[PDB]
Design a protein around this ligand. Structure first.
Ligand SMILES: *[C@@H]1O[C@H](CO)[C@@H](O[C@@H]2O[C@H](CO)[C@@H](O[C@@H]3O[C@H](CO[C@H]4O[C@H](CO)[C@@H](O)[C@H](O)[C@@H]4O)[C@@H](O)[C@H](O[C@H]4O[C@H](CO)[C@@H](O)[C@H](O)[C@@H]4O)[C@@H]3O)[C@H](O)[C@H]2NC(C)=O)[C@H](O)[C@H]1NC(C)=O
Ligand SMILES: *[C@@H]1O[C@H](CO)[C@@H](O[C@@H]2O[C@H](CO)[C@@H](O[C@@H]3O[C@H](CO[C@H]4O[C@H](CO)[C@@H](O)[C@H](O)[C@@H]4O)[C@@H](O)[C@H](O[C@H]4O[C@H](CO)[C@@H](O)[C@H](O)[C@@H]4O)[C@@H]3O)[C@H](O)[C@H]2NC(C)=O)[C@H](O)[C@H]1NC(C)=O
Ligand SMILES: *[C@@H]1O[C@H](CO[C@@H]2O[C@@H](C)[C@@H](O)[C@@H](O)[C@@H]2O)[C@@H](O[C@@H]2O[C@H](CO)[C@@H](O[C@@H]3O[C@H](CO)[C@@H](O)[C@H](O)[C@@H]3O)[C@H](O)[C@H]2NC(C)=O)[C@H](O)[C@H]1NC(C)=O
Ligand SMILES: *[C@@H]1O[C@H](CO[C@@H]2O[C@@H](C)[C@@H](O)[C@@H](O)[C@@H]2O)[C@@H](O[C@@H]2O[C@H](CO)[C@@H](O)[C@H](O)[C@H]2NC(C)=O)[C@H](O)[C@H]1NC(C)=O
Ligand SMILES: CC(=O)N[C@@H]1[C@@H](O)[C@@H](O)[C@@H](CO)O[C@@H]1O
Ligand SMILES: CC(=O)N[C@@H]1[C@@H](O)[C@@H](O)[C@@H](CO)O[C@@H]1O
Ligand SMILES: *[C@@H]1O[C@H](CO)[C@@H](O)[C@H](O)[C@H]1NC(C)=O
Ligand SMILES: *[C@@H]1O[C@H](CO)[C@@H](O)[C@H](O)[C@H]1NC(C)=O
Lengths: 387, 387
């Protein structure tokens, strides 16, 4: 979407994966979907280095809506958002952050909240703009294929017509099998800043793997359509939550990074461990994710040892390499060379291990190297020529 | 097996899961299957509380064998075990520990090392007893069903004839699909102290779930056959390794405990975290696993919320409850009462949370309680009547 926004993948925090549709504030005031939840998270983002590292979006997901007023204007839940959305947006803006919101192109949101039907698209768009929202996620529950085909471009137009730059996250392709011919990626690139291609992430390694495997199976189609202003969205980061081990947490961060994926956290930032913070706030990882060229990486190698190699092209002739172990036994000594990974010329490279910080110099195409990769884990290299 | 051994499930360390068939001592001297590895693990068990908590078995798995000598006598790898097995048994005994070893009822071990064929059963048994081995895992690769049917009873008899008490772990059922009509569990209980029913565990939550699932689907068969001296064996604990998150690690521990499974670690005790050690060395957890009655627990409840409840009967009218979340979203507030979990009327109960140590008291059948369970995690209660 040619709206000046998201020339790099969006970084921030989204409520859904960790906090879901928890509306029971009476029994659970600290974790329910409420203005308090968002204000506290915003505070964490401002104070704990998140915003300074590039995590700027703070996104409301489903279950925020109270209803529509006498004029049909959406309103938040009065008990859970007492000061209103404009107040929240102001708060978020004052901390140097951006506010995202959620709506559904259909009769209802997936959790049954008032939907943005075709005749409400313009009104809701104007409402979000008036509120000074910075990002919209438009879901596609309770709609027909025809309604989505009309509705998603309708919202893009409506958002444009408001004059406010609003990042546009489209769930459209996820409701269509995510593939051509049903999905027209050329159109999506023109109307959206990013799109959910595939299934919702759940807090498990199995879920991460199923998403990865789908993106890799269809990378010939998906890799080229991504770039500055228009991204594939494989869904939220799970880092900080319950389902992933340490190795798996580091793996998702690395793999979402080579895929030029959004870096959208969904975890309790109030109680997040230093170890998980270290993953998410890795300065080199973020630099690679935010690379100005915006070229989505690819799986370039799969071996019978169940070691996979991913590669992402970067600016200044640099590359990102992710050595990924799908093994479930023990650490594995992966022996390779840059020549075997389709690097050419007589260029002498140097690599920095993204997690350990170690530097490997004197890497020519023929130079044999070993990386030790842990089960369900990664070794990641930032690779560059030296002279 | 009526040899006076394993009246409670065996506790210890088994090499396989973590260290597999690593024989590269030149490149990897710290982690290869070697005399050194077993002594170092034994030192850790002696010095780090493991022995004191009841972990007494240090078990060699596959890839130890060097060959057979001129008399057909089994020999360890002379390079990796330069002092031989008696040296290792003697070392381990001097630390108040017991030594386990591995053989295969078939032409070869699963990794292709010399097998204990039918004509070698008696000789190898005598060798192991002479070495002062305390436990044997008899694997079943590269054999026919009839060879196993002769071989397993033959080995039990041959071990007995040595006069040395040797705990007998039988992989027999795992090669026969683990179920009736092919597996006769009354037979197994007579000839074995424990048996591997099912698939090799791998370092993943998927693996743990598939094993759990199989054991739960067939609990009507499997639960009654377990008892003092004869245990079901769902395979090694993954706690301390790569594939399990903290919640999942606590879950496997709790679930193996309600299943009256062996507590056989397979992890690097040299580098094990405090947090993983705390799981494995939990005194109440061990007490429950080692309950003198040896009654295998059952899954008693499965809600559409994907909360499962397991119950294990214990001595002194006590019980173990495991509330297990198969959810992959967020913490869940599970609402229940002991009456809903089919407990006896008019009795007042008290429960200690096995992980937090908290005591919930004054629980009648009708008393509503709430337990907060994390995704892929558990809450575990030690429950008892109070006067
Ligand atoms: C509604 O929809 C329209 C599209 O139909 C959007 O209009 C586009 O807005 C974007 C963002 O503001 C414009 O992109 C920017 O153009 C700037 C100037 O380019 C002009 O000059 C060239 C001459 O070759 C023309 O071809 C072109 O049409 C423009 O008239 C650039 O300076 C900007 O560059 C950015 O990137 C560089 C990195 O290389 C940075 O250094 C800069 O700082 C800067 O960020 C940028 O490319 C685009 O021109 C508009 N398109 C059209 C067709 O008009 C509206 O934004 C949209 N409205 C809303 C609110 O959504
Ligand atoms: C090789 O194989 C032989 C034969 O199978 C094994 O010998 C058996 O060893 C077990 C375990 O030590 C013995 O079981 C125990 O017997 C005790 C006394 O039983 C006597 O009375 C019975 C008849 O009632 C006779 O069969 C027997 O000969 C004895 O004279 C019991 O008191 C023990 O009870 C245990 O359980 C009870 C309740 O369940 C508890 O209250 C106790 O605490 C206690 O733990 C137990 O049952 C068995 O008697 C032996 N059988 C025979 C035929 O000799 C060898 O041990 C084995 N050797 C090696 C090296 O592997
Ligand atoms: C367990 O091991 C026995 C013993 O034989 C041993 O293992 C074999 C694989 C060979 O490496 C032998 O040198 C070794 O002593 C196995 O029985 C033997 O199997 C082999 C291989 O199939 C038989 O040879 C074959 O004979 C047929 C028919 O004539 C030919 O078509 C083949 O080309 C080949 O020569 C051999 O006759 C047989 N020996 C005896 C005495 O039975 C057995 O296969 C193995 N079992 C299991 C469960 O794997
Ligand atoms: C999206 O909703 C529309 C609106 O109709 C609603 O649902 C009806 C079943 C009923 O509860 C109305 O009061 C609601 O307003 C659906 O369009 C209707 O479809 C039904 C078939 O079930 C048909 O009988 C009606 O004539 C339709 N309404 C009109 C006047 O257009 C639509 O089906 C919903 N989309 C989906 C598939 O979820
Ligand atoms: C594809 C898509 O947007 N998926 C969303 C998910 O991310 C979340 O927003 C949920 C809330 O009810 O509704 C959908 O399933
Ligand atoms: C069922 C069974 O015993 N499984 C074993 C496994 O536990 C391990 O010992 C391996 C060694 O090569 O051989 C088999 O797969
Ligand atoms: C890389 O290692 C292999 C051994 O597996 C060796 O044959 C080869 O010569 C090495 N490559 C170079 C150029 O050193
Ligand atoms: C337990 O809670 C339920 C509501 O879930 C309530 O209806 C019931 O009366 C309660 N039982 C007791 C004895 O408190």
């Amino acid at each position: 979407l040619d709206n000046g926004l998201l020339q790099t993948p969006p970084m921030g925090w989204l409520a859904w994966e960790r906090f879901r549709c928890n509306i029971n504030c009476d029994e659970d005031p600290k974790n329910c979907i409420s203005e308090q939840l968002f204000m506290e998270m915003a505070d964490r983002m401002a104070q704990d280095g998140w915003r300074d590292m590039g995590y700027t979006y703070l996104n409301i997901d489903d279950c925020w809506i109270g209803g529509r007023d006498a004029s049909g204007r959406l309103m938040p839940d009065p008990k859970r958002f007492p000061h209103g959305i404009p107040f929240l947006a102001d708060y978020v803006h004052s901390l140097g952050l951006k506010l995202g919101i959620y709506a559904d192109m259909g009769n209802f949101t997936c959790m049954g909240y008032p939907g943005t039907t075709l005749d409400k698209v313009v009104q809701d768009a104007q409402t979000f703009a008036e509120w000074k929202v910075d990002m919209l996620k438009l879901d596609g529950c309770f709609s027909t294929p025809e309604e989505r085909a009309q509705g998603y471009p309708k919202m893009a137009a409506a958002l444009n017509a408001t004059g406010r730059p609003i990042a546009f996250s489209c769930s459209w392709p996820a409701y269509e099998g995510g593939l051509p011919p049903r999905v027209q990626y050329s159109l999506l690139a023109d109307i959206c800043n990013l799109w959910r291609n595939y299934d919702d992430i759940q807090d498990s390694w199995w879920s991460v793997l199923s998403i990865l495997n789908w993106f890799v199976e269809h990378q010939d189609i998906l890799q080229p359509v991504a770039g500055p202003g228009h991204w594939n969205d494989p869904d939220m980061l799970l880092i900080g939550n319950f389902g992933l081990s340490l190795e798996q947490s580091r793996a998702q961060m690395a793999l979402w990074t080579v895929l030029a994926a959004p870096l959208l956290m969904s975890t309790d930032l109030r109680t997040i461990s230093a170890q998980n913070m270290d993953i998410l706030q890795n300065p080199l990882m973020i630099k690679i994710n935010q690379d100005p060229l915006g070229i989505q990486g690819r799986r370039i190698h799969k071996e019978k040892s169940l070691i996979e190699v991913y590669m992402r092209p970067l600016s200044n002739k640099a590359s990102a390499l992710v050595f990924f172990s799908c093994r479930t036994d023990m650490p594995y000594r992966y022996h390779s060379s840059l020549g075997q990974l389709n690097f050419t010329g007589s260029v002498i490279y140097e690599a920095q291990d993204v997690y350990s910080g170690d530097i490997i110099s004197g890497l020519r195409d023929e130079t044999n190297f070993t990386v030790i990769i842990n089960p369900s884990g990664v070794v990641m290299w930032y690779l560059y020529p030296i002279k």
